[PDB]
Amino acid sequence: AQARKLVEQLKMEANIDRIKVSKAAADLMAYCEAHAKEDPLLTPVPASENPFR
Amino acid sequence: TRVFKKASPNGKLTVYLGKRDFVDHIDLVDPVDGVVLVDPEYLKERRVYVTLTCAFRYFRKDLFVANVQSFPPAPEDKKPLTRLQERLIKKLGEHAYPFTFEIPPNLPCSVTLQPGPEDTGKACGVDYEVKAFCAENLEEKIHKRNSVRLVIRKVQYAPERPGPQPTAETTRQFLMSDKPLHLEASLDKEIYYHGEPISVNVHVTNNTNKTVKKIKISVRQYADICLFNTAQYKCPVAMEEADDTVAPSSTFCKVYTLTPFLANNREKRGLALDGKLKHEDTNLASSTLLREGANREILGIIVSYKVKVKLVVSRGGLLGDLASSDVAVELPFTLMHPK
């Protein structure tokens, strides 16, 4: 009966409307590089106001 | 294309198969698919059954035997008509009845041990036979004419993982390693292809209070082979000498290239070789994947490789010199064909 629940689980993911990887990758890269002028992990020491040093 | 047919004798029961080099990359293996052609003009036995055997040898201490009944449709299984079989049915005609052997991970690679001169009549090692027969009963002796075998091999190729750089270091030993004396031998990579040299670098320091003689770089073959219980074997593959120039307080940083090749180890007894279909001139044995690096449990032939670096001291007297005064390290590597 486990396969009967497995087919129900796969049915929910069998009706998806996924998008192509070109649009997804372009959107991800563009968006998460546009809102990227804050990260102090990269671009270290934004100013003397580095709170941990 | 070029399906390999065998044309079993008496003009009956021809068997066709695809590639005879079924591949086991790390785990999982291509099923042994094909079509057996049986003309139903006699039907004396009314039952044709094809079997696959992983028999080990030098008789026939078998490993895994499976049987398939195919003259009746055998409605229990519904294996799809393979890409080869879809056209094979049309090519062979009406009497093309398919067969497929889906083999789980059961037996190791088909590695045949090197026969000795005046000690070779048949193959000796691990091989698959794939017998076919037409018998009414289950285990009656067919032999005779309508019995056909077809030697197939399972081989493993190079995985897409170079691996780390093998390193080792030893520091002390009986009345030999006393003042600082360490070996920092390393390797280049973990995957090598047959006929391609392997290089090793040494970083001995010799800060000791006694001199050391020339080193001896060697390649070992750790062929773990046994059927009844377990055993272990270790035979040389290639070796190279060195020079007697290491002085106290001198960091020798030489590099050496060794090429394991079969042109010289022709007379070595027990040197494992890759699968031989019919007494052919094969290559050296390729190292196997040891139970996907998770189980370390085997039931057949294991071939593994490791280099060795030995150092001589040439002790000089009675001050506790005549003892175990040799330092050595071992670096494993996997020597495989590429694909």
Partner: protein, 340 residues
């Protein structure tokens, strides 16, 4: 056997449809979109703070939403709330069970949870009446050991377990409102989302499964790994997530595309992954390792921006402040290193 064979046939057909959908997103890979981005400046983060207050090894940690207070759980029965700025202690909480594999910090900074082999996800009330922090309402617990738990809010919490089922709790009543089942092996970690409406969970079945907290339908299963998934964290856009694995991989998945975007490796690393996190923009995909080091992977180049050091043991936890100001590494050496 007819029913089982039919079920297997439909499962094979559904798998064929799923792989067809995944492969239909082949207009490109992240190699055509790999150019025009300047290579990241070599990231050599230096330990700004070394939090040395724990006795036993460390498993998990979670920064507060104020980007100041970080919690940490140990096997000495201690759950210490540090002040990352002043490297001091604020609260140390004894645990009823010595072994714990998780901890969390409430989004409002009011509660802190834990959990471990005791099958108990104890919730603590930091804003006490007049004294030490008390165990508020120990959740009933699943049939397997708890692995990770994160807060939806102060009133709702979602927990993961080794019982193959994650569940969404309700601290007010203490009883599960819904339970998410469908995995095969033990669930190792989960991660919420910026919209706080969906969460995934990578299990021993080597399959990251997206979950919807409304009715519990596993909308998409993000398979692709060969070893069990140890840790997952959502992308800052709430649109992707990177899953670490024992096979030294850090494959990134996309919810919209529903397949792998990268596989992260260096052909030298053989140890698995212990924890994963992202920077504010997600460009610095962080990753701990079993070989006492942490490698900072670019989200687009797949080449490490730098390698961490220090901890002489498995780095079992990894976090980034909500403000992204710095990252915090914890390991089995009972020392928390803060890498600016």
């Amino acid at each position: 056997q007819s029913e089982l064979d039919q079920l297997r046939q439909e499962a094979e057909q559904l798998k064929n449809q799923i792989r067809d959908a995944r492969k239909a997103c082949a207009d490109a890979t992240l190699s055509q979109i790999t150019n025009n981005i300047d290579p990241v400046g070599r990231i050599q983060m230096r330990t700004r703070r070394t939090l040395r207050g724990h006795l036993a090894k460390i498993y998990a940690m979670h920064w507060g939403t104020d980007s100041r207070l970080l919690v940490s759980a140990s096997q000495d029965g201690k759950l210490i709330i540090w002040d990352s700025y002043t490297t001091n202690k604020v609260h140390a909480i004894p645990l009823r069970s010595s072994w714990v594999m998780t901890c969390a910090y409430a989004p409002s900074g009011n509660y802190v949870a834990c959990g471990g082999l005791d099958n108990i996800c104890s919730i603590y009330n930091l804003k006490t009446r007049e004294g030490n922090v008390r165990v508020s309402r120990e959740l009933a617990g699943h049939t397997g050991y708890l692995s990770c738990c994160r807060f939806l809010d102060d009133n709702q919490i979602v927990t993961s377990s080794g019982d193959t089922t994650c569940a969404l709790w309700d601290i007010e009543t203490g009883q599960q409102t819904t339970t998410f089942t469908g995995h095969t092996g033990d669930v190792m970690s989960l991660s919420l989302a910026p919209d706080t409406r969906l969460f995934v969970s990578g299990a021993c079945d080597a399959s990251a499964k997206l979950w919807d907290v409304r009715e519990g339908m596993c909308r998409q299963t993000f398979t692709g790994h060969e070893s069990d998934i140890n840790a997952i964290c959502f992308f800052p856009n709430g649109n992707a997530f990177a899953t670490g694995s024992d096979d030294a991989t850090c494959r990134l998945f996309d919810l919209r595309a529903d397949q792998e975007l990268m596989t992260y490796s260096h052909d030298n690393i053989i140890c698995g992954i212990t924890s994963v996190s992202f920077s504010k923009s997600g460009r610095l995909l962080l990753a701990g390792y079993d070989d006492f080091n942490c490698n900072v992977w670019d989200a687009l180049k797949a080449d490490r921006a730098g390698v961490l050091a220090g901890h002489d043991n498995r780095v079992s936890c990894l976090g980034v402040t909500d403000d992204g100001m710095a990252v915090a590494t914890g390991s089995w050496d009972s020392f928390l290193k803060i890498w600016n």
